[PDB]
């Protein structure tokens, strides 16, 4: 388990591994906003 | 006339008054209207 | 003009969705078949026909939910809602598997309506009706598998149930009880399907890799205009390529497209012939010479004999739960096994 | 503008292809992707530490980075048991913080930084056709890789050593005092057969060989980096390769595809660089452990043995196919002829029995998805798809060099000049 | 009340009903 | 031209030979011809092979009692495993034949030949000045062949688990794979089935649409010298107005499907099996209510209990 | 219009939810509840045996 | 074990054949313009 | 004896392939 | 067994050397757009 | 709830940059 | 035999009906 002090931030640590996927999606969002130009 | 024969004739009518008669009504109604 | 003329004019109107005369048969039948399949996979159980749970309501997912075939007590009955089996009771009609008959019949009529729709639309655009002849392949598949096979068997029970895992069961059941892989017509069907996939992939790659440089952009999808009298790809370059890579190549675009049409259609029709043969248990199950050789020579073994043993194991270990109406009870001693051999 | 199909010829779904001829934005994209990789490393390490249950082993909790950290010797005691997870937390924190710096660098060099580098920073600019500059960059990054390999060597020999499964009485964190620097062993490993019984480089079964090979790799990479910095490609190399960004990309793609296949085989078969106390037993290891447990339960309270195709004594049954397995819990029971029955009867240890039973319980090939299975499947798939990418990018690089990647010229089609066959 | 309108609502009113039914099925005890 | 080696290069890479050789053809032709002749000789006369390794050989040759359907080149002996087994690594030619060595020979030379075929397709595309991605399309059947012939034996640890070079042997491979791994419930085999079915559907559709709209220039095939219908059959939006995009999709769909099914075979080689929905429905009392997945599992168990042929 | 949809669609979704939550789906379609797969007298799988007495047989099977 | 060479005689084919063919290539290579080109590929042949 | 028939059919098919490859109708531009 | 091995090694080495030195002989220049 | 809130904030942070750039009419 | 014949003759009905109803456009459009 996490060291006890940092155990409160577990809910961030439980979502952080999937962040790069959102980055990919974010790129598409930028291409959507730009109008796929 | 067995209950089976009655079910068959009622089946014939329901097809006429629920499928054949309504759907055509629309075709004659809407075709004549346009 | 006459009512017919006015109705024909209205049905032929250029709307978002062509209706036509064939629509009067296609739209209600197809809509009812699809809705009945959704209703069966969502609410209707198979507990009283197959001894199984096949609904989202019972806890099944997309793979395990199915509209199961009627009970083996029904025979080849039409299972009309007003018929003597159900007598107008919707609940009993759903419990006995009548929704499968509903879906199958209205879906067969929907396939007929869609074929007529292809014919009608081809007659209006002014083109040859090579659609609705290609669709005769899927029509024959559906007729042979979902209609002719159960009609040749004991009842509708042995037809495929409308589900993913149900279709997989049907595949393994047919393999176990018929050895359908050994059937030459099924082999021709497999050849047709795989060759059609090969033709699709190879033709797409060949066209994409022989395009003319009709644009200055690196992405070449823009260099094709919708009304293009000139050809967008080099047939001569593609011919030379395959002539010198494979040894033979297409030189006629017409023939090539007719061949790409013909291969899957011929495969499907051959597989339909094989399934029609299976409908009467007239199966290419075994080779008599190989069986005689294995009987008089215990040291003679081929992969065909191993397949026979696998089919026997499939039948013996799936009969009890796949056909609960027969009340099969097989002791562990008579169940085939590899160690038991 | 350079950010649309009108000015570049590339659509949005091929939009990063617009980065080929602009250096600053390409550098920013690479630094941003590096930041993404470091962020994933740190975040996944924190995720695994946060879900680590002390009683369960590492391989029973679906963890793949903690075994990598345990192989390096951090937070592991004798027998593969995990003492504390704090160094793993430190590793995750350091990676996830350096990810912020790398991401800022990528964003800066991508968005606001100069599009091209040679007009403002001539020491960093390039043309994809200046062979000397590209070889210089290759040599610098080769020196970096060699220094990384030497850093692993220093960790192995000086800073706490590395975990060794082949230590007596179970694995332990050991300092690699004398690595194998003899070139014959390394060359034989590189030139070994890849088939069953030999295994090529996957079959390295001791830490000394690993450390010596990494010494050789680091020094060779440093020497080659200095070479490529101080030299230019020769005449045979210049006429053989396409000199463009896409060609170099394809070369890297096929290299990493081969590396992915090698790593998948390493995770599936090797139990020295991938200890079974962290990654779980291999499939052959699990099968042989089940057979050995049955043999032990037959000896207590012969059946279970047969002869190999070369005549040696091996475990009998469906395991016979896995007689090439070498595992620490079974090596003391194996003699020159093969496994020895009296040595199993007498010279057996309780820890070997415990290892055999616990590996029998958890079988990748089947006696629970093994972490070895996940690593092997993932990196085999990655190797295959990157071979596909190499083929695509190499073919397109060849076509673009020649000038026919956009289609055939109607004015002068080549086939039309060739005589018919 | 057009053919597109009638076809859409024929393919929408059961769709939403079945979506609600399946969402309710998701919270059954099992 | 100016050199003997230059002349040799200008003949290996000549576009005038009836069939292109090329450099990939320098490796492809010997390997493919060797595998072809060894396969023919084995399919007619090979001795029976002890595939299981327990001294009960299995016959797959025409001369030992097999027909075209039942004939196969039996995979290598389970005692061999995935050890390299050439002719010179066997004590005698008889023992080489007895342990399934010709299977390894054919498989290795055939894989080298199909890799050479991929490279040769690229090479002739480059020689003709056309685009090079036909080989990318051909990678998918090559990937499938390597998965069923090389990758699966590597993951399982024995060439005896590879697909036999026959028809009934292929069926046995499919049945044993379904028993052991439940490939039907694997999403990648489902993607492959979708790929092949879509390929057949799209080939038939494209052929029907091209043949239907043939311009009257005339057999109708002699009319050739060496969208509205589709948008009315379905709603207007679903239509491939761009011919190049349509052909790209035609190339893409089955290739992607076969790639996915080959990847699924590779993953199941390392025991990344299909979905398991067994015993997914229970009543209040705890009794298991069977589904179609349970019937599928019963069939898989029936197949598996007669593969062991041992404890 | 949108306003209409903003009332009709949620009401229809709630009706679909209540069709299952109130147990009306089981009654309408005959799907057994999780507590009524096996009765005390019949611990076996219930199967229809005759086609012309199927309604009465199902009434007998589902009576308990 | 290296390259499956268990008998020294196997090294004779392994070395003499690559050298001999290189000798044929040496003549192609010497008949060429081996000056640098500054392009994606060398069209001089 | 059926092995003779099988071998004859296989070589006939291979010969048909050979003649189709090396004795095809030569394509020409019309 | 040795003679078959040496023959196979000779043949494989010859073909691999031909492949390697053929793709080293400025293969990119062997395209129809080359001047 | 904490996981959902953190996920929502992280998912908002991405498009928020694009929205702010569009509001300031920068190089998007 | 007659089931297979009936299926093949359904195919024949489709083909010959298409031939007679779309005769004008048979050589092509
Ligand atoms: C392509 C073009 C078409 C496009 C698709 C069209 C789809 C729409 C139509 C599909 C459904 C058609 C109706 C099928 C109903 C049926 O079949 O109903 C079946 C009934 C017969 O019923 C069966 O009859 C059998 C024999 O019983 C007889 O023998 C028994 C012996 O114990 C008893 O004595 C019993 O009392 C006695 O009646 C068994 O009893 C079965 O249990 C019972 O189900 O036939 C009948 O109604 C009529 C029989 C006349 C033939 C008409 C159908 C012909 C089609 C092929 C039929 C199968 C042949 C083999 C195919 C391979
Ligand atoms: C090139 C030829 C490709 C085929 C050669 C054989 C590939 C293979 O069997 O590779 C396996 C080898 C590992 O071999 C194994 O290596 C093992 C090493 O373990 C040994 O050493 C270990 C040390 O920890 C342990 O002690 C263990 O107990 C002990 O047995 C054993 O020796 C096994 O017997 C041996 O089979 O991986 C390697 O050498 C690295 C090579 C990876 C090749 C990956 C597959 C080839 C590419 C397929 C692409 C298909 C898709 C594209 C199509 C287009
Ligand atoms: C294109 C329209 C179409 C077609 C072809 C069919 C065809 C069919 N339906 Mg479907 N159905 C439809 C529309 C259609 N239906 C609609 C709109 C509804 C909703 C009300 C239904 C609801 C429905 C149910 C609930 C059931 C069917 C069933 C059936 C089958 C038996 C028909 C039968 O014997 O009825 C007999 C009646 C007729 C054929 C009507 C014909 C009327 C004649 C031609 C007019 C003359 C009458 C005469 C003068 C009076 C005496 C058959 C395959 C049954 C089945 O097989 O399921 C398993 C069944 O249970 N249908
Ligand atoms: C990880 C993968 C990756 C990377 C590193 C890049 C990087 C880049 N792309 Mg590529 N791209 C990608 C994936 C990627 N892309 C994918 C998947 C697609 C397909 C949808 C594209 C499609 C595409 C096109 C079509 C184009 C690019 C272009 C570019 C460049 C500038 C983009 C721009 O103008 O930003 C504008 C975007 C914004 C202003 C909004 C995003 C703002 C930042 C980046 C968000 C970052 C969030 C992060 C948490 C901030 C950290 C702060 C830090 C202090 C910690 C840049 C080098 C362009 C270019 O330069 O071509 C010459 C171009 O034309 N790309
Ligand atoms: C490894 C990839 C990489 C590469 C090749 C470069 C290369 C470059 N960067 Mg970038 N940069 C990177 C990563 C990289 N940077 C990262 C990770 C960050 C985040 C900290 C930055 C942040 C950054 C800023 C903020 C600036 C540069 C600048 C520069 C240029 C001048 C740097 C110089 O002369 O070094 C000199 C040597 C050192 C700085 C080393 C000192 C520490 C030891 C040069 C083109 C400058 C520029 O204007 O060019 C665009 C600039 O202002 N970089
Ligand atoms: C990522 C690292 C990297 C990269 C991209 C390059 C790239 C290059 N090098 Mg450099 N080099 C490197 C590392 C690297 N080198 C290192 C570490 C060294 C030190 C040994 C050298 C020493 C070196 C010299 C001395 C020369 C090059 C040359 C070249 C060029 C042509 C190379 C060629 O055609 O290969 C040819 C490849 C072979 C002939 C294959 C040899 C394989 C050996 C026998 C080992 C076999 C292993 C195994 C059995 C087979 C591989 C299996 C695989 C799965 C690992 C090219 C620009 C040449 C050049 O033109 O530059 C001046 C040149 O003369 N390099
Ligand atoms: C280090 C590796 C690497 C690098 C730098 C490049 C770089 C490039 N490639 Mg290559 N490529 C690679 C690997 C690589 N590729 C591999 C491994 C493959 C095989 C799959 C390909 C196949 C390939 C093709 C077929 C093409 C390129 C193209 C390109 C160019 C534009 C890429 C672009 O805009 O992306 C845009 C990014 C996207 C459209 C996003 C795609 C998202 C994928 C499909 C999802 C995959 C699953 C995902 C990872 C899971 C996340 C789940 C999420 C969706 C929820 C660029 C030069 C194109 C080009 O212009 O050629 C020069 C082109 O046509 N590449
Ligand atoms: C170009 C096209 C080439 C086509 C032919 C390629 C080779 C085909 C395979 C031949 C083969 O397997 O022979 C098996 C024998 C060994 O058999 C072994 O011979 C041994 C005796 S001895 O070694 O031959 O003295 C003995 O163990 C036993 O007879 C037998 O196992 O191998 C040879 O002797 C071949 C040597 C000459 C090769 C020429 C090619
Ligand atoms: C998430 C996801 C992932 C992958 C992509 C994806 C697939 C798109 C997506 C899925 C999304 C999903 C989950 C999509 C699912 C959408 C659903 C569940 C649509 C349900 C529609 C129900 C209909 C049409 C029933 C009509 C009833 C009728 C006709 C009654 C018939 C009657 C019967 C019974 C017989 C008696 C007579 C009558 C009265 C006629
Ligand atoms: C201390 C502490 C104790 C324990 C708990 C704790 C909280 C976890 C820890 C905190 C650690 C901390 C505070 C860690 C710090 C973590 C942070 C803030 C990491 C952020 C990294 C940013 C990256 C990788 C962005 C790169 C930009 C990209 C890829 C943009 C690309 C784009 C380009 C260029 C253009 C458009 C396309 C796209 C793709 C959109
Ligand atoms: C962990 C960490 C450490 C501690 C500090 C910290 C800062 C709090 C943190 C860092 C956090 C970081 C680095 C956070 C950065 C987070 C990011 C980059 C979030 C991006 C979110 C974008 C989404 C979800 C787009 C969804 C679009 C969809 C689904 C649709 C797209 C569609 C469009 C429109 C176009 C059509 C195609 C499709 C694809 C259909
Ligand atoms: Cl078997
Ligand atoms: Cl066992
Ligand atoms: Fe076409
Ligand atoms: Mn196996
Ligand atoms: Mn088995």
Residue numbers in the entry:
A (entry chain k): 9 to 45
B (entry chain x): 1 to 34
C (entry chain d): 11 to 351
D (entry chain c): 38 to 338, 352 to 417, 433 to 486
E (entry chain f): 13 to 42
F (entry chain a): 10 to 227, 232 to 239, 252 to 336
G (entry chain e): 20 to 83
H (entry chain w): 29 to 73
Show sentences the authors wrote.
Photosynthesis converts light energy into chemical energy by two photosystems, photosystem I (PSI) and photosystem II (PSII). Both PSII and PSI are composed of a reaction center core associated with outside antenna proteins which function to harvest light energy and transfer them to the reaction center.
Our PSII-ACPII structure also did not contain OEC, suggesting that the cells we used to purify the PSII-ACPII are in the S-phase. The inner layer antennae subunits ACPII-1/2/3 in R. sp. NIES-2332 is similar to those of R. salina, but shifted to become closer to the PSII core compared with those in C. placoidea. ACPII-1 shifted to a larger extent than the ACPII-2/3 subunits. Due to these shifting subunits, the Chl-binding sites on these subunits are also translocated, with their translocating directions consistent with the shifted direction of the antenna subunits.
